[PDB]
Design a protein around this ligand. Sequence first.
Ligand SMILES: [Zn+2]
Length: 42
Amino acid sequence: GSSGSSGQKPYVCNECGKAFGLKSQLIIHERIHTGESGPSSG
Ligand SMILES: [Zn+2]
């Protein structure tokens, strides 16, 4: 059931707090904060 409660994930997101066992995995995720098709507010 859990999305993934097993595995060492050093790469943690400082925006939400999502951990990614891989580096690039986090880089792509952080993108959601960097900018999503413009400023959410609008
Ligand atoms: Zn995040």
